[PDB]
Write a protein that holds these residues in place. Sequence first.
Motif, PDB file in Angstrom:
ATOM      1  N   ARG A 157      19.851 -27.038 -22.810  1.00 39.37           N
ATOM      2  CA  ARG A 157      19.824 -25.581 -22.753  1.00 39.37           C
ATOM      3  C   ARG A 157      21.205 -24.948 -22.638  1.00 39.37           C
ATOM      4  O   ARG A 157      21.285 -23.714 -22.588  1.00 39.37           O
ATOM      5  N   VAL A 158      22.283 -25.734 -22.582  1.00 41.90           N
ATOM      6  CA  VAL A 158      23.615 -25.160 -22.760  1.00 41.90           C
ATOM      7  C   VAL A 158      23.710 -24.485 -24.120  1.00 41.90           C
ATOM      8  O   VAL A 158      24.411 -23.478 -24.278  1.00 41.90           O
ATOM      9  N   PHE A 159      22.991 -25.009 -25.111  1.00 42.18           N
ATOM     10  CA  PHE A 159      22.950 -24.417 -26.449  1.00 42.18           C
ATOM     11  C   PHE A 159      21.822 -23.387 -26.517  1.00 42.18           C
ATOM     12  O   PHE A 159      20.836 -23.518 -27.248  1.00 42.18           O
ATOM     13  N   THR A 160      21.998 -22.337 -25.719  1.00 39.22           N
ATOM     14  CA  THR A 160      21.112 -21.184 -25.698  1.00 39.22           C
ATOM     15  C   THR A 160      21.973 -19.933 -25.779  1.00 39.22           C
ATOM     16  O   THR A 160      22.973 -19.813 -25.062  1.00 39.22           O
ATOM     17  N   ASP A 161      21.597 -19.014 -26.662  1.00 39.73           N
ATOM     18  CA  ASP A 161      22.297 -17.743 -26.805  1.00 39.73           C
ATOM     19  C   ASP A 161      21.813 -16.816 -25.698  1.00 39.73           C
ATOM     20  O   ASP A 161      20.713 -16.266 -25.772  1.00 39.73           O
ATOM     21  N   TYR A 162      22.634 -16.644 -24.657  1.00 36.34           N
ATOM     22  CA  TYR A 162      22.267 -15.788 -23.532  1.00 36.34           C
ATOM     23  C   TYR A 162      22.908 -14.407 -23.662  1.00 36.34           C
ATOM     24  O   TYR A 162      24.067 -14.293 -24.079  1.00 36.34           O
ATOM     25  N   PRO A 163      22.174 -13.353 -23.302  1.00 44.37           N
ATOM     26  CA  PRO A 163      22.787 -12.026 -23.209  1.00 44.37           C
ATOM     27  C   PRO A 163      23.953 -12.046 -22.229  1.00 44.37           C
ATOM     28  O   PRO A 163      23.958 -12.803 -21.253  1.00 44.37           O
ATOM     29  N   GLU A 164      24.949 -11.201 -22.507  1.00 42.11           N
ATOM     30  CA  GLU A 164      26.186 -11.230 -21.733  1.00 42.11           C
ATOM     31  C   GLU A 164      25.951 -10.894 -20.264  1.00 42.11           C
ATOM     32  O   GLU A 164      26.651 -11.424 -19.392  1.00 42.11           O
ATOM     33  N   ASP A 165      24.974 -10.040 -19.962  1.00 41.07           N
ATOM     34  CA  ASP A 165      24.758  -9.587 -18.592  1.00 41.07           C
ATOM     35  C   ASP A 165      23.653 -10.351 -17.863  1.00 41.07           C
ATOM     36  O   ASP A 165      23.277  -9.956 -16.754  1.00 41.07           O
ATOM     37  N   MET A 166      23.123 -11.440 -18.455  1.00 42.22           N
ATOM     38  CA  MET A 166      22.130 -12.241 -17.746  1.00 42.22           C
ATOM     39  C   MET A 166      22.754 -13.538 -17.259  1.00 42.22           C
ATOM     40  O   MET A 166      23.460 -14.201 -18.030  1.00 42.22           O
ATOM     41  N   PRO A 167      22.537 -13.917 -15.998  1.00 39.65           N
ATOM     42  CA  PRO A 167      23.049 -15.202 -15.508  1.00 39.65           C
ATOM     43  C   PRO A 167      22.586 -16.363 -16.378  1.00 39.65           C
ATOM     44  O   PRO A 167      21.399 -16.500 -16.692  1.00 39.65           O
ATOM     45  N   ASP A 168      23.544 -17.197 -16.774  1.00 36.85           N
ATOM     46  CA  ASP A 168      23.314 -18.350 -17.641  1.00 36.85           C
ATOM     47  C   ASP A 168      23.352 -19.590 -16.752  1.00 36.85           C
ATOM     48  O   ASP A 168      24.432 -20.115 -16.450  1.00 36.85           O
ATOM     49  N   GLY A 188      27.342 -30.199 -15.074  1.00 33.00           N
ATOM     50  CA  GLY A 188      26.152 -30.289 -15.893  1.00 33.00           C
ATOM     51  C   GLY A 188      24.880 -30.121 -15.092  1.00 33.00           C
ATOM     52  O   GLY A 188      24.875 -29.642 -13.955  1.00 33.00           O
ATOM     53  N   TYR A 189      23.772 -30.542 -15.703  1.00 32.22           N
ATOM     54  CA  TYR A 189      22.454 -30.352 -15.114  1.00 32.22           C
ATOM     55  C   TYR A 189      21.533 -31.472 -15.585  1.00 32.22           C
ATOM     56  O   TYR A 189      21.872 -32.253 -16.479  1.00 32.22           O
ATOM     57  N   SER A 190      20.358 -31.549 -14.963  1.00 34.53           N
ATOM     58  CA  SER A 190      19.352 -32.537 -15.334  1.00 34.53           C
ATOM     59  C   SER A 190      17.988 -31.859 -15.368  1.00 34.53           C
ATOM     60  O   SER A 190      17.801 -30.779 -14.804  1.00 34.53           O
ATOM     61  N   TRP A 191      17.026 -32.495 -16.038  1.00 30.56           N
ATOM     62  CA  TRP A 191      15.698 -31.901 -16.129  1.00 30.56           C
ATOM     63  C   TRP A 191      14.626 -32.978 -16.202  1.00 30.56           C
ATOM     64  O   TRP A 191      14.894 -34.128 -16.559  1.00 30.56           O
ATOM     65  N   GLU A 192      13.409 -32.591 -15.826  1.00 34.48           N
ATOM     66  CA  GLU A 192      12.240 -33.455 -15.894  1.00 34.48           C
ATOM     67  C   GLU A 192      11.085 -32.660 -16.477  1.00 34.48           C
ATOM     68  O   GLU A 192      10.926 -31.473 -16.186  1.00 34.48           O
ATOM     69  N   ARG A 193      10.271 -33.322 -17.290  1.00 31.76           N
ATOM     70  CA  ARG A 193       9.296 -32.619 -18.112  1.00 31.76           C
ATOM     71  C   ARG A 193       7.997 -33.403 -18.197  1.00 31.76           C
ATOM     72  O   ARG A 193       8.012 -34.634 -18.302  1.00 31.76           O
ATOM     73  N   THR A 194       6.879 -32.682 -18.148  1.00 31.12           N
ATOM     74  CA  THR A 194       5.571 -33.230 -18.483  1.00 31.12           C
ATOM     75  C   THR A 194       5.062 -32.557 -19.750  1.00 31.12           C
ATOM     76  O   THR A 194       5.280 -31.358 -19.961  1.00 31.12           O
ATOM     77  N   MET A 195       4.377 -33.330 -20.588  1.00 33.32           N
ATOM     78  CA  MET A 195       3.854 -32.850 -21.864  1.00 33.32           C
ATOM     79  C   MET A 195       2.410 -33.325 -21.978  1.00 33.32           C
ATOM     80  O   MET A 195       2.159 -34.532 -22.069  1.00 33.32           O
TER      81      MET A 195
END
Length: 210
Positions: free
Chosen positions: A60-71, A80-87
Motif C-alpha cells: 500500500r505504499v503504492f497508493t495515490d493519497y490525497p495531500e491532506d490525508m494521513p498516509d 516499513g510495515y507488515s500485514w496479515e490477511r484472510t480470504m
Amino acid sequence: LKEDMKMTYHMDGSVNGHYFTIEGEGTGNPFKGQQTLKLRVTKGGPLPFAFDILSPTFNRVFTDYPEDMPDYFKQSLPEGYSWERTMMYDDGASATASARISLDKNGFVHKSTFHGENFPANGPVMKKKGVNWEPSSETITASDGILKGDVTMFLVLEGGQRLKALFQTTYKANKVVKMPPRHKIEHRLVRSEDGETIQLQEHAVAKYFT
C-alpha cells in the motif's frame, strides 16, 4: 522515496497442499499509486491453480493519497510495515497471507507467505479458469495505531461467471504514525502471462467517503 521506485519479491506458499516459491522484481510510482511486477515461479511450477488467488499478496505504499490525508504506509518508511490477511471464498475455500514491506539499497523488499486450502478440485480456481479480479473498493478503518481493510472481491472467470471472496486485512506500521480517518482505496489489478513469467499491474487511489 522517489517517483521511480524498484521492488523485489519473494513468496513461500501452498495451495491445497501444493507448495511453491515465487520471486520477481517490480517498478512503480508510489505517489501515483502505480506499479508493474514481473514474477517467476522458482519452485513447484507450473502452478496447478489460477494465479489470481495469489496476486493481491504481491504494498500500500503504492497508493495515490490525497495531500491532506494521513498516509499510513508512506509514514511507516523507512522501517516499513507488515500485514496479515484472510480470504474467504463463496465455495468454502479459504486462504491466509502475510507480508513484510521494507527497504534496502535497491528499493522495496517484499517478503510474503500464502496458505490456501479447500479449493474444489474441479472448481474454476483449480482448473485455472480465472481471468482477472474486478476493480474493487476497500474500506480502511483506523484504531489503536493499526488499520483494518475490508473488501469484497470478485474474480472474473471464463464463461462470464464471477467467484466472490471476502478479504480482511490488518496493516501494522510498527511505529507511531499520524492516523487517517475512515476512508476507501479503489484498486484495479490486472494480470498477464506468457508461459515463463507473470505480470501484475495495480493502480490504487485513496479517497474520502462521499
